[PDB]
Design an enzyme around this catalytic site. Structure first.
Site, PDB file in Angstrom:
ATOM      1  N   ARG A 144     -22.547  -7.299   8.170  1.00  0.00           N
ATOM      2  CA  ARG A 144     -22.103  -8.670   8.419  1.00  0.00           C
ATOM      3  C   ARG A 144     -20.679  -8.697   8.953  1.00  0.00           C
ATOM      4  NH1 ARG A 144     -19.213  -9.923   3.417  1.00  0.00           N
ATOM      5  NH2 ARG A 144     -20.026  -8.734   1.636  1.00  0.00           N
ATOM      6  N   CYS A 187     -14.463  -2.082   7.141  1.00  0.00           N
ATOM      7  CA  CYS A 187     -13.382  -2.572   6.294  1.00  0.00           C
ATOM      8  C   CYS A 187     -13.306  -1.742   5.022  1.00  0.00           C
ATOM      9  CB  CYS A 187     -13.653  -4.027   5.879  1.00  0.00           C
ATOM     10  SG  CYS A 187     -13.723  -5.233   7.261  1.00  0.00           S
ATOM     11  N   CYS A 231       0.788  -1.230   0.000  1.00  0.00           N
ATOM     12  CA  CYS A 231       0.000   0.000   0.000  1.00  0.00           C
ATOM     13  C   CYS A 231       0.820   1.280   0.000  1.00  0.00           C
ATOM     14  CB  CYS A 231      -0.890  -0.082   1.269  1.00  0.00           C
ATOM     15  SG  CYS A 231      -1.672  -1.735   1.481  1.00  0.00           S
TER      16      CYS A 231
END
Ligand code: COA
Ligand code: CL
Ligand code: MG
Ligand code: ZN
Ligand code: ZN
Lengths: 392, 133, 392, 134
Positions: A194, A205, A85
């Protein structure tokens, strides 16, 4: 790295982020052209070196990006870079270094990735392909989730506290057309999405996204030569590798983010309390919250107070993730490090319309890491400190 | 056509052929005394001379996560953790058991079990940790 | 790139090349350790920056290499680089630039790759259907085969002439323990090996291999402080990207190799007739033959005569591929460009025993390309010119 | 996917007239600098986006070629590909129709259409190739 002479950002470029059907080379070309147009570069023979960051698409990403622009050739050395990243930020760093050293007077950094046309959904990213943790099933969701589990254990913080990070970052992105996800979402919607890696639910996320961004840099004379009205000065930029060991490190700290941000403060002469906006590696909600303390925005123990008091949103000490962060753009590995810089530049220039920070920021910091290497919290870290470079 | 591993890994997990209890293996550098998992050279002083150190079968869950979206190809859910040993070494490993049952600082014990399928679709047996009585 | 101050190579490192059951990080670390020990480094953190080239192992290969040396951390900025086969040479180039510009006084470049331990589909070594020539069935061996057919058409070269490149390069490697394939192979064995794309047979193509090499570079003052006995001067180094167009080209030439080598001669002040040894991108026999002309070792059309006259082996104008080339080592993508430099340094220092060139070479040149979408000859080219840097 | 993969390559390079006229390759000439090229979003020489469509000659000349015995996955071997130069000074990469061991450099060839590969639905992609004239 100390800059041997001043280095300024002229034009920047950014694609919309999300699920793209065009590949990494097209996205990269679009961002690069936007950055060149924003630099009053109207010919293929002006930029003098190019660096392009990427994670998993290609071994010649930058040559693929520049091919259709007629810019490859004997007067454009292109080098592609990787540090998971960090790569998009490392591309800009390499371009800065060429200018600062006088190897060039005008260079470009590009970050680009397309993930979704090259993988199946329904699975998380592992750690490094050759890594021992990958053998045992490591995924990056769970690696960050473990930091949240430990943080909750040590501080009493709840999943509802962590969820406030998504709420804020999505709020920031509401009026930003480049973000993937944006707008009003409640703590309850974040927490009841979820479960992915306990206690990280889906909406905590970052997305697996496609996109690209680009940054043209040049000397003080080159800005004038190009008629750049709002050159952004690189006040500092720092690259580190992460300490490696198999000892029981406190994963609620972050060795490399702590040391990289301190070095950036020291080299730039700008302290954390002077930073007006910050784009950081909010790959998961817990990461942003931990980095308030790691980067010295607040004192030890005050990260959640900092959040709850509004100090990381509009009107506070430092607007963190004003573009929406990775939690709104999603995270194309090779692109995010450059995209943070493009949006920080636009904010410094007052160009972000409905998501513009007020008062106009004068000091903007960015941060990306890069991981998957066992025994390191992150393999790499790159941080840039940028400031207004046009007088009044 | 030569077959894929079914065990991970003899350099870190010792299975006594006598049938003794398995154990994780550390190595102590003879020159500087640093303890680590197996390496070709010592990360502290670059020495290549070590003594093998059987490690404690008992450890503590430093942190863990219940994984619902796994790596490509892995059955879900599964659980993994940082397990800290008395020798001041941290092991990454799967935890045996059910989601929604582990806690930080929980004591756990070494156990052998399947961590994934190999390329011949046979289980790879490796080290995991489980709850104690 | 013009060097702002002199840069010298101190220690180098090199693993055996072939099928390894240890991965890229172990190999890279072995090569890095050798190069550091060969530089008389007592304090590893004297190394102020590291660049690592790789093609497809992982996104954090350099951090995975250095972590096992205890060297990752705030005092070692690591950037990984990619340009398909150019990567290992670009890693050394980045290290040289850091030293030449004064960003550092001592830096390291590593190139490493392990292919054979990993399932690589075959599509990873090729471009996507998106690439127009790939859509129409292109494969790399056929692209180079077309270059050979055109050369046979123009010069009368036979398949037996082409096969002599494999024979020569394996002969050179006979006593080289690092090389994979070596020793006597007959022309008929090469010509009678399986046909891939006429006239390229299997033994005329380099194969996939695993390996690593490393190069420490530093300032003149650092060579004196480290007590380096035979510092090798970097006389020049050049990186280019390949021009894109769709006009007829003379494919017995090579646009980017021609311009890169000419720029290398101009910057270094050393012409092609002064080069005593040369390592180049012998991915196929025909490539080495054409590059005799493309690099100006001989005139246009004279490469066949150069070969037949023995001018590219011992006793000739320039010993080409004295280590054995890619045709003897195989080709770990990230490693080859660094490995060429390591072996050229050993030759300049007289250290290669049974494969040592006599009389000792004083000028050594190296060349790798990499990639090549439609309309380009190659995506990248990196060349280094190295000369003896010690007196008498 | 039940949305189909392509069966033709490519509408901006190979013109198949709807009235049944003979197909032809086409280029696009930059109106600012005059560079001829296959279709592109911007001129790679001068970055103009203003073009004129140029029909290209159906006759070309094999500059070089190779008989492929080990080629791309999923294509029937042997096959043949080549650089085919057009008199407008553009080079086209294409498969050649015919048998191995029959082409030579500088041979004249003519445009034709045929399957160059199978698509993701295992149906042929039709595109341009070149063939012997006599
Ligand atoms: C959380 C995660 C596993 C979810 O992926 P997934 O379960 O496979 O979900 P899918 O891709 O199939 O998408 C399902 C739907 O949810 C949405 N969605 C996907 N990911 C989302 C996310 N992270 N946040 C919010 N919504 C998401 C939709 O886009 C998508 O609907 P669509 O079909 O219209 O596009 C994945 O986003 C992930 O792994 N993120 C972390 C990535 C990472 O680790 N990056 C490196 C950090 S260092
Ligand atoms: Cl990370
Ligand atoms: Mg030291
Ligand atoms: Zn030691
Ligand atoms: Zn034009």
């Amino acid at each position: 790295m100390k800059l041997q002479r001043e280095v300024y950002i002229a034009g920047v470029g950014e694609t919309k982020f999300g699920k793209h059907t065009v590949d990494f080379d097209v996205l990269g070309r679009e961002a690069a052209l936007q950055a060149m147009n924003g630099s009053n570069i109207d010919r293929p023979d002006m930029i003098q070196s190019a660096y392009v960051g990427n994670g998993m698409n290609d071994m010649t990403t930058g040559q693929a990006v520049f091919r259709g622009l007629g810019m490859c050739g004997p007067n454009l050395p292109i080098i592609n870079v990787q540090s998971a990243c960090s790569a998009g930020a490392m591309a800009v760093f390499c371009a800065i270094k060429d200018v600062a050293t006088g190897v060039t007077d005008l260079s470009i950094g590009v970050g680009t990735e397309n993930h979704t046309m090259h993988r199946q959904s329904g699975a998380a990213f592992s750690a490094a392909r050759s890594d021992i943790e990958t053998m045992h099933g490591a995924v990056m969701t769970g690696k960050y989730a473990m930091r949240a589990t430990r943080y909750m254990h040590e501080t009493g913080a709840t999943i509802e506290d962590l969820a406030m990070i998504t709420v804020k970052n999505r709020k920031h992105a509401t009026h930003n057309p480049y973000a993937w996800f944006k707008g009003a979402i409640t703590v309850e919607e974040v927490v009841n999405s979820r479960m992915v890696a306990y206690p990280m639910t889906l909406q905590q996320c970052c997305g697996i996204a496609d996109g690209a961004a680009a940054v043209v840099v040049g000397s003080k004379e080159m800005m004038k030569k190009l008629g750049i009205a709002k050159p952004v000065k690189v006040a500092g930029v720092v690259v580190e590798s992460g300490p490696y060991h198999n000892r029981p490190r406190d994963i609620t700290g972050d060795d490399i983010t702590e040391t990289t941000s301190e070095k950036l403060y020291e080299e730039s002469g700008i302290g954390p309390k002077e930073v007006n906006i910050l784009e950081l590696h909010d790959a998961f909600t817990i990461a942003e919250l931990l980095y308030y303390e790691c980067m010295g925005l607040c004192k030890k123990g005050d990260g959640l107070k900092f959040l709850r008091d509004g100090q990381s949103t509009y009107g506070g000490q430092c607007v963190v993730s004003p573009r929406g962060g990775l939690l709104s753009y999603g995270h194309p590995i090779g692109a995010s490090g450059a995209a943070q810089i493009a949006q920080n530049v636009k904010q410094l220039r007052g160009e972000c319309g409905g998501y513009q920070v007020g008062p106009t920021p004068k000091v903007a910091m960015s941060h990306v890491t890069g991981g998957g290497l066992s025994g390191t919290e992150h393999a790499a870290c790159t941080m840039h400190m940028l400031v207004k470079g046009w007088g009044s | 056509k030569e077959p894929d591993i079914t065990f991970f890994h003899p350099d870190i997990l010792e299975v006594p052929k006598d049938g003794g209890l398995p154990y994780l293996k550390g190595y102590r550098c003879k020159k500087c005394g640093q303890l680590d998992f197996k390496t070709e050279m010592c990360t502290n002083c670059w020495s290549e001379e070590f003594e093998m150190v059987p490690l404690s079968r008992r450890g503590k869950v430093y942190s863990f996560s219940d994984i619902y979206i796994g790596q490509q190809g892995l059955a879900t859910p599964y659980i993994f953790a940082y397990v800290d040993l008395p020798e001041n070494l941290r092991v990454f490993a799967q935890l045996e058991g059910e989601v929604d049952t582990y806690r930080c600082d929980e004591e756990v014990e070494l156990t052998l079990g399947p961590i994934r399928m190999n390329n011949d679709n046979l289980p790879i047996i490796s080290y995991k940790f489980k709850k104690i009585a």
